Amino acid sequence: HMSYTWTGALITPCAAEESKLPINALSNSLLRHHNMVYATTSRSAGLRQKKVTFDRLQVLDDHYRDVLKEMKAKASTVKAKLLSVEEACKLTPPHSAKSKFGYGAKDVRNLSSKAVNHIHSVWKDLLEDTVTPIDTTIMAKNEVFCVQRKPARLIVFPDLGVRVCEKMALYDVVSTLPQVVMGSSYGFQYSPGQRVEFLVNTWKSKKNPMGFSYDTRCFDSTVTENDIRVEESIYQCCDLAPEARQAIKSLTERLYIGGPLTNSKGQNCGYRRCRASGVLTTSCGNTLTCYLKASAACRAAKLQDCTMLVNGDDLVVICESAGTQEDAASLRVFTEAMTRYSAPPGDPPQPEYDLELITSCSSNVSVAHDASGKRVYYLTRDPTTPLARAAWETARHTPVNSWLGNIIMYAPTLWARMILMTHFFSILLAQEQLEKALDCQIYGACYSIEPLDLPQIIERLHGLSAFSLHSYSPGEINRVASCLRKLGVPPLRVWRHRARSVRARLLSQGGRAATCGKYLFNWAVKTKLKLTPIPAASRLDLSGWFVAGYSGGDIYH
Ligand SMILES: COc1ccc(-c2ccc[nH]c2=O)cc1C(C)(C)C
Ligand SMILES: [Mg+2]
């Protein structure tokens, strides 16, 4: 029951890999300790190969079979539709990996003959053959981090032709089914602001609240053939077209169960017997499996009045505390049950009695004050990775602007407002790129966003409180300050000074740019302007946002 078996061939790159931080004229205004910032390359893939290769022991009890019975019952109410080639072709990101059949993502999007004719022949083969393993490509990811070096994470994905067919058969399923099965526990249905409301309300709902979070050591590699087979039966509970049932069955047996791994040089690297990281069902199947395992473990641990919040492998549990001594024991049992379900932890969970202490999605809840001085809870995180990645994005244009994603999702935070908003609006002003659409990742999906619509966007997911946040917790300010010292980032006083200029340059331009300067940079000036609800904020067509997660799913909205 090994996750992977390797022939010997190496995980080869598709190009020359840049590991050191590229420097330009704008770099030093943000970061000075360039050596601390790096990117991962195929040279450290062998380390991760060793880390992701292990044997899986799974023991399934009555708690497991009970939860699944309930899950299949809720799943039976779902009616899902098949997607047309055209619909699936428009969901493909513009820079998605090109086919080994002589066409790219842009040919797929333009609905070219070579692309559409190939998509049709792959679909026909999926309905006619349900046994032959589908070929996947194994690659080492190029991600930017700060030191204290991590080995490169792997990405396993099928051909562009298979990916369009996956969307056709399972896009509606992976988008609709998770909320029906899990209700209010599906985290991807929440905006950052709505997620806080849920956590705070849930914490307040308990007499003596206890909370903890769970992180699985290599979740994708812990996923067994049984787990993937169990996910298929959940999808098969839906009311589906006959063509969609055969395509799901086929994709399961040929792609999702496992298959061979191929490098950039066309060599067989080995065989995969766990979850593929770069398929449409990556996020859905991980959330369902984690939820099934954790719900049954919650029962095994005899945890009182549980409230789960799942998104991929990330899980948060808020319940009624039975005393510190019993609470430590309950969590030991939870861990032991999860381990038997083929999901051991990275670090053992610990009971927490303060919401600000729970860490999930590399984040935590913190307290700040709004304009009136009323306490307001918001979601934050350590700025080290966002800043290291913003530093890379200062010197090089990338397909996913992390800074933009971070400004959208962490808008109320001290670091995103003072550093990110200031630095990039200063660049967009200078380069006259204020009206240019930029791509960013939100819950694993790719979105083209206009930087001028940022104030309206921030109001819908955080409310007017985000533009008025002050008097941050001592611990948060200390975390930002230590991080700036570590990376050689100018202190927050220099950022205040720059923000007044950015604000002034923005206000001068009028229209949407003045609204940007007015709302986003009100914190910089002493003579504050009245920030009222933006009429434009309500008009925003945010349909498609916070519906589901698509990490590794190759989705574009
Ligand atoms: C499941 O929760 C998340 C997943 C991703 C991001 C995220 C953070 C930054 C950029 N893009 C993203 O999608 C943020 C969150 C919360 C916890 C802050 C809501
Ligand atoms: Mg994990």
Atom number of ligand 1 nearest to Cα 549: 1
Q: Which of 361, 378, 402, 408 to mutate to test the pocket of ligand 1 (most atoms within 8 A of CB)?
A: 361
- Would you say 482 and 488 are in contact if contact means Cβ atoms under 8 Å apart? no
User: Measured in angstroms, how far is the CA atom of residue 497 from the centroid of ligand 2?
Assistant: 40
For 334, other C-beta atoms within 10 Å of its C-beta total 24
- Would you say 138 and 271 are in contact if contact means Cβ atoms under 8 Å apart? no
Write the residue with the smallest CA distance to atom 16 of ligand 1: 192
Identify any residues that bridge with 447 across adjacent strands, giving them in sequence order: 440
Domain range for 400: 362-557
Amino acid at 320: E
Cα–Cα nearest to 347, from 335, 361, 365, 333: 335
What is the distance, to the nearest Å, from the Cα of residue 189 to the centroid of all Cα atoms in its chain? 13
Do 310 and 330 reside in the same domain of the chain? yes
Alpha-carbon dihedral 325, 326, 330, 335, rounded to 10 degrees: 10
Atom number of ligand 1 nearest to Cα 363: 17
Do 202 and 316 reside in the same domain of the chain? yes
Tokens of 467: 């533009």
Alpha carbon distance 423, 419 (integer Å): 6
Do 200 and 301 reside in the same domain of the chain? yes
Do 61 and 177 reside in the same domain of the chain? yes
Write the residue with the smallest CA distance to atom 14 of ligand 1: 409
Identify residues after which the chain is interrupted (C–N over 2.5 A). 148
Tally of structural domains, the chain: 4
Which single residue is written with the structure tokens 């009616």? 79
Any residues with Cβ below 6 Å from ligand 1, and which? 187, 192, 195, 311, 361, 363, 379, 405-406, 409, 441-443
How was this entry determined? X-ray
H/E element holding 390?
helix 384-395
Question: For residue 195, what are the contacts with CB-CB under 8 A and spacing of at least 6?
Answer: 187, 309, 379
Alpha carbon distance 103, 116 (integer Å): 10
Cα–Cα nearest to 39, from 362, 381, 391: 391
Q: Which of 194, 213, 313, 363 to mutate to test the pocket of ligand 1 (most atoms within 8 A of CB)?
A: 363
Which-ligand-closest: CA of 311? 1
Which-ligand-closest: CA of 408? 1
Cα–Cα nearest to 348, from 358, 334, 362, 361: 334
Tokens of 132: 């032959």
Alpha carbon distance 445, 549 (integer Å): 7
Of 308, 334, 361, the residue at which a domain comes to its end is 361
Do 246 and 291 reside in the same domain of the chain? no
Which-ligand-closest: CA of 347? 2
Provide the CB-side half-sphere exposure for 348 (13 A, CA). Answer: 12
Question: For residue 210, what are the contacts with CB-CB under 8 A and spacing of at least 6?
Answer: 318, 319, 320, 321, 327, 351, 352, 353
Do 237 and 263 reside in the same domain of the chain? no
Which-ligand-closest: CA of 551? 1
Write the residue with the smallest CA distance to atom 2 of ligand 1: 361
Do 343 and 376 reside in the same domain of the chain? no
Do 209 and 236 reside in the same domain of the chain? no
Alpha carbon distance 385, 383 (integer Å): 6
Cα–Cα nearest to 416, from 343, 526, 492, 503: 492
Confirm whether residue 313 is marked as ligand binding: yes
Identify any residues that bridge with 540 across adjacent strands, giving them in sequence order: none
User: Measured in angstroms, how far is the CA atom of residue 316 from the centroid of ligand 2?
Assistant: 13
Report the DSSP pairing between strands 363-369 and 37-39.
unpaired
- Would you say 271 and 261 are in contact if contact means Cβ atoms under 8 Å apart? yes
Identify any residues that bridge with 7 across adjacent strands, giving them in sequence order: none
Of 333, 361, 389, the residue at which a domain comes to its end is 361
Cα–Cα nearest to 444, from 326, 279, 212, 330: 279
For CA atoms 282, 284, 289, 290, the dihedral sign is positive
Phi, psi torsion values for 141, nearest 5 degrees: -70, 145
Amino acid at 265: K
DSSP 150-184: PPPPEEEE--HHHHHHHHHHHHHHHHHHHHHHHGG
Cα–Cα nearest to 536, from 457, 465, 425, 450: 457
Do 294 and 375 reside in the same domain of the chain? no
Of 291, 326, 361, the residue at which a domain comes to its end is 361
Do 175 and 286 reside in the same domain of the chain? no
Do 341 and 375 reside in the same domain of the chain? no
Do 62 and 33 reside in the same domain of the chain? no
Question: For residue 8, what are the contacts with CB-CB under 8 A and spacing of at least 6?
Answer: none
DSSP code of 256?
Answer: I
DSSP code of 34?
Answer: G
Provide the CB-side half-sphere exposure for 38 (13 A, CA). Answer: 13
Question: For residue 38, what are the contacts with CB-CB under 8 A and spacing of at least 6?
Answer: 19, 20, 21, 144, 145, 146, 147, 149
Atom number of ligand 1 nearest to Cα 191: 19
- Would you say 57 and 217 are in contact if contact means Cβ atoms under 8 Å apart? no
Atom number of ligand 1 nearest to Cα 360: 17
Resolution in A: 2.8
Confirm whether residue 125 is marked as ligand binding: no
Tokens of 45: 């893939």
Atom number of ligand 1 nearest to Cα 381: 18
Write the residue with the smallest CA distance to atom 19 of ligand 1: 192
User: Measured in angstroms, how far is the CA atom of residue 23 from the centroid of ligand 2?
Assistant: 33
